[PDB]
Design a protein around this ligand. Structure first.
Ligand SMILES: CCC1=C(C)/C(=C/C2=NC(=C\c3[nH]c(/C=C4\NC(=O)[C@H](C)[C@H]4CC)c(C)c3CCC(=O)O)/C(CCC(=O)O)=C2C)NC1=O
Ligand SMILES: CCC1=C(C)/C(=C/C2=NC(=C\c3[nH]c(/C=C4\NC(=O)[C@H](C)[C@H]4CC)c(C)c3CCC(=O)O)/C(CCC(=O)O)=C2C)NC1=O
Ligand SMILES: CCC1=C(C)/C(=C/C2=NC(=C\c3[nH]c(/C=C4\NC(=O)[C@H](C)[C@H]4CC)c(C)c3CCC(=O)O)/C(CCC(=O)O)=C2C)NC1=O
Ligand SMILES: CCC1=C(C)/C(=C/C2=NC(=C\c3[nH]c(/C=C4\NC(=O)[C@H](C)[C@H]4CC)c(C)c3CCC(=O)O)/C(CCC(=O)O)=C2C)NC1=O
Ligand SMILES: CCC1=C(C)/C(=C/C2=NC(=C\c3[nH]c(/C=C4\NC(=O)[C@H](C)[C@H]4CC)c(C)c3CCC(=O)O)/C(CCC(=O)O)=C2C)NC1=O
Ligand SMILES: CCC1=C(C)/C(=C/C2=NC(=C\c3[nH]c(/C=C4\NC(=O)[C@H](C)[C@H]4CC)c(C)c3CCC(=O)O)/C(CCC(=O)O)=C2C)NC1=O
Ligand SMILES: CCC1=C(C)/C(=C/C2=NC(=C\c3[nH]c(/C=C4\NC(=O)[C@H](C)[C@H]4CC)c(C)c3CCC(=O)O)/C(CCC(=O)O)=C2C)NC1=O
Ligand SMILES: CCC1=C(C)/C(=C/C2=NC(=C\c3[nH]c(/C=C4\NC(=O)[C@H](C)[C@H]4CC)c(C)c3CCC(=O)O)/C(CCC(=O)O)=C2C)NC1=O
Ligand SMILES: CCC1=C(C)/C(=C/C2=NC(=C\c3[nH]c(/C=C4\NC(=O)[C@H](C)[C@H]4CC)c(C)c3CCC(=O)O)/C(CCC(=O)O)=C2C)NC1=O
Ligand SMILES: CCC1=C(C)/C(=C/C2=NC(=C\c3[nH]c(/C=C4\NC(=O)[C@H](C)[C@H]4CC)c(C)c3CCC(=O)O)/C(CCC(=O)O)=C2C)NC1=O
Ligand SMILES: CCC1=C(C)/C(=C/C2=NC(=C\c3[nH]c(/C=C4\NC(=O)[C@H](C)[C@H]4CC)c(C)c3CCC(=O)O)/C(CCC(=O)O)=C2C)NC1=O
Ligand SMILES: CCC1=C(C)/C(=C/C2=NC(=C\c3[nH]c(/C=C4\NC(=O)[C@H](C)[C@H]4CC)c(C)c3CCC(=O)O)/C(CCC(=O)O)=C2C)NC1=O
Ligand SMILES: CCC1=C(C)/C(=C/C2=NC(=C\c3[nH]c(/C=C4\NC(=O)[C@H](C)[C@H]4CC)c(C)c3CCC(=O)O)/C(CCC(=O)O)=C2C)NC1=O
Ligand SMILES: CCC1=C(C)/C(=C/C2=NC(=C\c3[nH]c(/C=C4\NC(=O)[C@H](C)[C@H]4CC)c(C)c3CCC(=O)O)/C(CCC(=O)O)=C2C)NC1=O
Lengths: 274, 74, 48, 162, 172, 162, 172, 172, 172
């Protein structure tokens, strides 16, 4: 039932389903009380298209809750290829820029900071780019400017929860997944009492940020490689965070901007207080 | 020119122009060799808002570069 | 149980063929309630 | 300014690295290619005068209405600034040929093109048609790898304008 | 990232071996046909805009639902996204064609792409078709260009097709 | 894996850009250069056996003490793992020759080299001396641009180890 | 960034002109000598470590104060910084040599460098000397290499020298 | 499964309490209006086929793309699936209406439904619309039936609407 | 499941059209070469056991680690599983070859396969290699059989190869 092979038999579109079952579907044949196996708390099964409506109806009745439906063939092509991003290409802006040296930087900051969503030409931050070109600001300075912009506020903040925002923030600004439940919490409390702007500053003035990017380096991916003071399970979070080269942050998804890192998963790396 | 243009998108209130002798606080070249920064980044003029003035200075000193000047931005 | 089960199974077999008739026994709520997913079929007619 | 030489040097520098066999092989391409490039350059250089007058006219022949009064192909100043502009394009094409890359085109014509053309009510279609014509005539001034080079850069401008 | 040589090298190394005389000459042949390859990549670059434009005109000629309200290439924002994706895919196909290997296409473009589109509600069958049209026109250009020396480019036209066909298959 | 082809493609991709005349000129270098590279590759390939035994021995002749008991050039297993290691280097040299760049060397021998050698008490000096010897003998197996290529990559390894 | 061609182009453009037949042939000659140039750049790359090492050994042979306590190449941290700077400068000199123009050297390396060293207390005259020693050895290698075709490289040896001499002058 | 009484009971139990006189009379009122409720459920049952049919005719009148090739209500197999889903949703809305609680609708029908449709490529906005049309016609029938005693059914018409609106919201 | 005709039909239908004279003759040609196709499928069926056996002998000749303890084709149970998978893949490749379309191979065999092997700890690169060896021998048989009429089967040998190559690519 778990992770599948194949798609169809006569022909179908197999969908794999996931639920949470009562002892009504599955119980042991024991002398007392009806219980399902504790590890099949959420169970998944792959069903071809016709049997599918009948299965969902049954599951819902006897008590289960469907958690997901997704085609099997989507889910057979693995996990993302990460070769492009295991070790990236760094882009850094020099002291006397060359006229297109600076062109390189802007295109990359865009891609990285905005998480590969398209920024259309009406959309670009032109006045701010003027500034970088003249040297009035530096690459880190410019990077902070994009984050406080409406375009950044609008595709990533306004329409999703704070859990999601912060998780995106780590990916964009720091290039790495969020290590702890404390990190999520520490941030949510800051936004709540100092506002959005103070909270944005907190990733860009951090010691972690400063070491790796310094000030003239565009933030680049770095979570597919071992880092310091990183729990070990933050390397699996990175797969959940980045879905491949053609994937992007996208707020235009049918289901909306949502999570990607399970809250249960974060707790595995440690729980304390505050 | 780092001759600040406008308010340099800092918004906020007053603008202070602070120059520091930064070491590799910032700008280590991505190169294999020894965490240097370009030679002409010995003094780093930078304009910050009044609200962000204190935090920045704290992390400049903390990372070792020393402030060389401070003037109100205008 | 009754001559109705035979007529329903004969009519399903005539309308939908052999594979749909086999699926009708296995997707039955009687199969699910008493074998579930992990139990091999076994003789039951000796217990009320 | 983008050339094969500057590109490989940029890539070395950004990894804090001496030029290695990968980068020197690349450079040899640019140097081996110079002969064809520079033949295209010399032919485009001496025919410049007529290539420009040919393309200017073709803009009016393809957009007849431009040359009527109240229009932007009328009067000495419009028609003068047109010849000049096509001449700028041919000039940067020769530069790109000689330089071993699109740099001169990227830095002096492509960066900013649309903003300028949009503020000044200049249609790219004219410029594409100027270049399509220049491409037609350069078919019989050159051949072989010099023609391929000339074409590469003319087409590069046409894509920049679409 | 792999190219056709790099691929050879990885397979050799997995044997613990210097390249086989078999593999050597396969690569000698790639060098033999490399001028043609450069013309083929150049054919696409030199007509990128028209290849996308012409594919586009024809896609919406066929599927007039995409440009109605409710349709996935409506309003201007979505059409620009669709035009942008056509360019992105044509780009990575040209990269694969210079490389003699599909990997850059599969790793940087195709990996996850189908699931992105499904999440977005973008009709993958329409995207597959837009890729089929780009293929027709792109190959058109590879086969009938400006004063290139006359010869046989069918091997390269096939290989370009498989890159277009990989993308189509991966997405539909 | 760094080759002229992958490098130009990487540079295009990172600017969201089709390959242009700059990048195709570069590629022509790599293709024009293949003949010399691949001649070096074939010569290094068939002489591998003896190039390896020659260099292995030279490590012991230059560091006589290595072959005494209690030392790291003593016993079948050390001397076996040595031949193997030089063979790895020659193998990746041929790969780098065939590939048109240092990629195979960078990815399979350079990345991590010092950490490994330091944990295992392997002195780079041996390996430099193995390579210096291989460089001496390759002087008479090749000449002209095949020798220059062989040299380029042997020297690249020696610099990686200094 | 400029190379020798790009430089020509910038000067031509400032006249509003297509390149002069004067400038054309100057550049035709650079293409003429380019194989030699590649060998010259290759001479430096292939001996970078020894060029730095040998310059270094000799710098401290002469100036034994730098390696005493109180000296600017003491303790290990400072010696590593000094060795690193020797490499950085040799690197930008090799870039200039591939380019046929000093600009990358002046813009990315030499600009501000003297004032950096003075701020640091690094004795610029010693740094200038380390550059003079790198020059001696680097040119040594440019002139006497492995089975390169025999000919005259003095023009290129001069030009390499001026890049070493620019750096020295700029720093002292 | 919950009904309006069962819901009261669950909330009371979570306090550890016998039902509040507050809750008692809210339920006494539901019994008061129950004949009207039975007529309202009967209005839907008695016109189920026409409600689905009329919703359908109108859905495809508006969205003629669904019945073209490429469209999600083409060919016959898909249209039958779409007609079937219209019935399923109308059915669970009628169950909720007999129950005085949405839970059967949310738990057996709406839970997971959106993600099913997205997996399938079924345009959820069109499905939402089909639900809006069923609502219009269903309520039409609740309000204008065969020789039912005259009175005010607006409270029940609202409640039925919220069940239609839940489904729409959940799916779009 | 698709075959080469069925594929044509699906693409035609997505246009809302009767098959193009283009597509008609492509299919007329498939019927033209169908006797050869039957011999090609028959070549594989008639030597299935040897194709698997010979691939196997050679796989373990190369990768003697798989048959050591710790290795993924040790003990007998695992070797039987590995031999079984070799047969399964050869089987779906022969089905694709009768069909003139890869879909049965991709849908019933390759879909999810890589992720299965990774979950199991089965070295995918070794599995890819076993597939490459089956290809060599299978094609060997397609090309040199018992008293078949002499002619050219290279088109079919290519197509068979792409099915072997699909599987390899999908798994590695
Ligand atoms: C493989 C052997 C095996 C285990 C271990 C097992 C655990 C298990 N415990 C369950 C429920 C449960 N387990 C408990 C246990 C507790 N409640 C408390 O407050 C206490 C802290 C704790 C008792 C010490 C309760 C109350 C439920 C019912 C939860 C509910 O339905 O609300 C269920 C859900 C199915 C069912 O209710 O029968 C499973 C599968 N099932 C298994 O097959
Ligand atoms: C706070 C709002 C704000 C202003 C006002 C601003 C001005 C400004 N103008 C600049 C450049 C420029 N400004 C001009 C303007 C002109 N050239 C002429 O010949 C005319 C006389 C004039 C137009 C009327 C030009 C040509 C440059 C580019 C200079 C160069 O790079 O060579 C630059 C350098 C950065 C860049 O090129 O983007 C800044 C910061 N920047 C800002 O952020
Ligand atoms: C998008 C706007 C937004 C919401 C709504 C939000 C909820 C939210 N509540 C949280 C924690 C919390 N929420 C509560 C709330 C409660 N505890 C109780 O016992 C009561 C039943 C309830 C108060 C009525 C508590 C106690 C925690 C801390 C849990 C812990 O760390 O152990 C956290 C974890 C991060 C943190 O602790 O700061 C999030 C993200 N975050 C957001 O950004
Ligand atoms: C790795 C290279 C890469 C690819 C391939 C890529 C695809 C991609 N296409 C997207 C959207 C899109 N793609 C399209 C494309 C189409 N619409 C149609 O109806 C047609 C069938 C088709 C054009 C042929 C549309 C309309 C959207 C916007 C969807 C929306 O926001 O509603 C998005 C969401 C982010 C955004 O809108 O910018 C991604 C990530 N992104 C990448 O970074
Ligand atoms: C753009 C390329 C580039 C250059 C050229 C560069 C130079 C440079 N050399 C530095 C330090 C240094 N440079 C040296 C060099 C020397 N000491 C001596 O006594 C000798 C005379 C000489 C070696 C020949 C030393 C010792 C330091 C450390 C000074 C200190 O921290 O006390 C620093 C300070 C940052 C650091 O220590 O990493 C820079 C920026 N940085 C760059 O990014
Ligand atoms: C192996 C293929 C096969 C056959 C041949 C078959 C016959 C068959 N006919 C049946 C009933 C029936 N068969 C008929 C047939 C007739 N009534 C008349 O008056 C006419 C004389 C005649 C039609 C010409 C009727 C009316 C019943 C239903 C009897 C009842 O339930 O009262 C039943 C009982 C099960 C059911 O009703 O579905 C079987 C098994 N079943 C099979 O699986
Ligand atoms: C270095 C590269 C470079 C380019 C390419 C360039 C284009 C350019 N064309 C301009 C104007 C112009 N361009 C034209 C073009 C034409 N008129 C016609 O008869 C034809 C339809 C057409 C030629 C095909 C016209 C009429 C103007 C005057 C627009 C105005 O000021 O109203 C201007 C405005 C400044 C001016 O009035 O000169 C620029 C900047 N400038 C540059 O610096
Ligand atoms: C700037 C990068 C670059 C390019 C683009 C390049 C092209 C190039 N294409 C060539 C040949 C050619 N190119 C083609 C190509 C074609 N023949 C056809 O009929 C088709 C329409 C087309 C298929 C792609 C053919 C047939 C030859 C002659 C045979 C050969 O040299 O292989 C040659 C050999 C000289 C010649 O015969 O003209 C060069 C140098 N060289 C380069 O350095
Ligand atoms: C893919 C490229 C690659 C390289 C280059 C490589 C080097 C390498 N050499 C090793 C060991 C070794 N290397 C040597 C080398 C020598 N012994 C002598 O007689 C000579 C002095 C010298 C040869 C010049 C010795 C003796 C060991 C055994 C070290 C030990 O385990 O104690 C090991 C440790 C694992 C092992 O024991 O095999 C590595 C990884 N490994 C690789 O995967
Ligand atoms: C991989 C990048 C690359 C390199 C390095 C390269 C080198 C190269 N150097 C060459 C010639 C040469 N190279 C030199 C160089 C020298 N003569 C001396 O006596 C000095 C010691 C040294 C001064 C630098 C000379 C004299 C020639 C022959 C004349 C010429 O071709 O210009 C030639 C022409 C063929 C030959 O005569 O051997 C090539 C291809 N080609 C390339 O593609
Ligand atoms: C719990 C009660 C329940 C619901 C609600 C349910 C929905 C449901 N609708 C389905 C398909 C479907 N649903 C539709 C519906 C539509 N197509 C359109 O274009 C319209 C917008 C819309 C009609 C208004 C279509 C066309 C399919 C078939 C999709 C396909 O196979 O391509 C399927 C896949 C299984 C099957 O096709 O039988 C499920 C499970 N199944 C259930 O058991
Ligand atoms: C078989 C199951 C069953 C049903 C269906 C049922 C219906 C039923 N509806 C009734 C009243 C009624 N039913 C309605 C219904 C309506 N008034 C309108 O104007 C609207 C069009 C419609 C809105 C739903 C009204 C207003 C009354 C009279 C007031 C009342 O008794 O509450 C009554 C009370 C007797 C009467 O006044 O006729 C019964 C028994 N009883 C049952 O046992
Ligand atoms: C639809 C037709 C079909 C295919 C293709 C198929 C593949 C398949 N191969 C499997 C296992 C396996 N497959 C192999 C194969 C290999 N091991 C190696 O090292 C080699 C690289 C390779 C042989 C060339 C091995 C060793 C296992 C057992 C893995 C384990 O249990 O640890 C399993 C798990 C179930 C089982 O072990 O029986 C499936 C489903 N199953 C199918 O029904
Ligand atoms: C029982 C199912 C079945 C089979 C297997 C079948 C085979 C079959 N193969 C045939 C021809 C042939 N088959 C081949 C096959 C080959 N030629 C070669 O040199 C290769 C080694 C091999 C490649 C696959 C060729 C070349 C012909 C003659 C040309 C043709 O008829 O197309 C013919 C035409 C009569 C003849 O010329 O002998 C038949 C009937 N017919 C059937 O009904």
């Amino acid at each position: 039932m778990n992770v599948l092979t194949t798609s169809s038999q006569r022909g179908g579109k197999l969908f794999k389903v996931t639920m949470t079952l009562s002892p009504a579907l599955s119980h042991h044949p024991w002398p007392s009380l009806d219980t399902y196996e504790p590890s099949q708390n959420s169970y998944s099964v792959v069903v071809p298209l016709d049997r599918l409506l009948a299965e969902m109806t049954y599951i819902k009745n006897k008590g289960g809750r469907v958690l997901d439906i997704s085609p099997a063939d989507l889910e057979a092509l693995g996990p993302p290829d990460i070769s492009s991003v295991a070790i990236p290409l760094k882009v850094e802006l020099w002291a006397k820029a060359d006229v297109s040296d600076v062109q390189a930087a802007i295109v990359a900051a865009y891609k990285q900071i905005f998480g590969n969503t398209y920024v259309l030409e009406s959309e670009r931050l032109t006045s701010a780019e003027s500034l970088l070109r003249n040297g009035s600001i530096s690459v880190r300075e410019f990077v902070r400017l994009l984050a406080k912009s409406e375009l950044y506020k609008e595709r990533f903040f306004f329409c999703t929860s704070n859990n999601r925002f912060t998780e995106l923030n780590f990916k964009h600004f720091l290039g790495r997944a969020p290590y702890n439940q404390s990190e999520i919490a520490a941030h949510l409390d800051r936004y709540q009492t100092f506002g959005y702007d103070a909270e944005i500053d907190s990733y860009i003035d951090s010691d972690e940020y400063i070491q790796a990017f310094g000030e003239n380096v565009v933030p680049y991916y770095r979570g597919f490689k071992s880092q310091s003071g990183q729990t070990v399970e933050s390397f699996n979070r990175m797969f959940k965070l980045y879905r491949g080269d053609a994937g992007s942050d996208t707020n235009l998804n049918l289901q909306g901007q949502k999570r990607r890192v399970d809250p249960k998963n974060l707790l595995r790396s440690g729980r304390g207080i505050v | 020119m780092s001759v600040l243009t406008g308010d340099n998108q800092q918004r906020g209130s007053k603008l202070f122009k602070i120059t520091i002798a930064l070491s590799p606080t910032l700008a280590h070249h991505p190169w294999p060799g020894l965490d240097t920064h370009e030679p002409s980044q010995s003094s780093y003029s930078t304009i910050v808002s009044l609200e962000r003035l204190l935090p920045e200075m704290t992390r400049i000193k903390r990372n070792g570069g020393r402030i060389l000047e401070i003037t109100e931005g205008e | 149980y009754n001559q109705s089960e035979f007529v329903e199974h004969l009519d399903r077999y005539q309308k939908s063929g052999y594979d749909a008739e086999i699926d009708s026994y296995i997707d039955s709520d009687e199969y699910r309630r008493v074998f579930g997913e992990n139990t091999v079929p076994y003789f039951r007619g000796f217990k009320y | 300014m983008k050339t094969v030489i500057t590109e490989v040097i940029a890539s070395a520098d950004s990894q804090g690295r001496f030029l290695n066999n990968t980068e020197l092989q690349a450079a040899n391409g640019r140097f081996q290619r110079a002969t064809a490039s520079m033949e295209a350059a010399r032919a485009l250089t001496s025919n410049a005068d007529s290539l420009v007058k040919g393309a200017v006219q073709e803009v009016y022949n393809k957009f007849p209405y431009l040359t009527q009064p109240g229009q932007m192909g009328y009067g000495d100043t419009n028609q003068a600034k047109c010849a000049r502009d096509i001449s700028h394009y041919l000039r940067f094409i020769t530069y790109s040929l000689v330089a071993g890359g699109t740099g001169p085109l990227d830095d002096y014509i492509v960066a900013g093109l649309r903003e300028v053309n949009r503020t000044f009510n200049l249609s790219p279609s004219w410029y594409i048609e100027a270049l399509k014509h220049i491409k037609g005539k350069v078919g019989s001034q050159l051949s072989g790898q010099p023609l391929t080079e000339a074409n590469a850069y003319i087409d590069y401008c046409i894509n920049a304008l679409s | 990232m792999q190219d056709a040589f790099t691929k050879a090298i990885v397979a050799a190394d997995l044997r613990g071996s210097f390249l086989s005389e078999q593999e050597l000459n396969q690569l000698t042949n790639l060098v033999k046909e490399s001028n043609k390859r450069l013309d083929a990549v150049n054919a696409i670059t030199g007509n990128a805009a028209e290849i996308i434009s012409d594919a586009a005109h024809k896609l919406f000629a066929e599927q007039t639902d995409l440009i109605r309200p409710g349709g996935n290439a409506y309003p201007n924002r979505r059409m620009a996204a669709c035009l942008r994706d056509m360019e992105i895919i044509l780009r990575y196909v040209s990269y694969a064609l210079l490389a003699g290997d599909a990997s850059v296409l599969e790793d940087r473009c195709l990996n996850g792409l189908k699931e992105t589109y499904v999440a977005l509600g973008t009709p993958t069958r329409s995207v597959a078709r837009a890729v089929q049209l780009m293929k027709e026109t792109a190959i058109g250009y590879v086969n009938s260009p400006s004063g290139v020396t006359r010869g046989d480019c069918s091997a390269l036209v096939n290989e370009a097709a498989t890159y277009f066909d990989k993308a189509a298959a991966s997405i539909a």
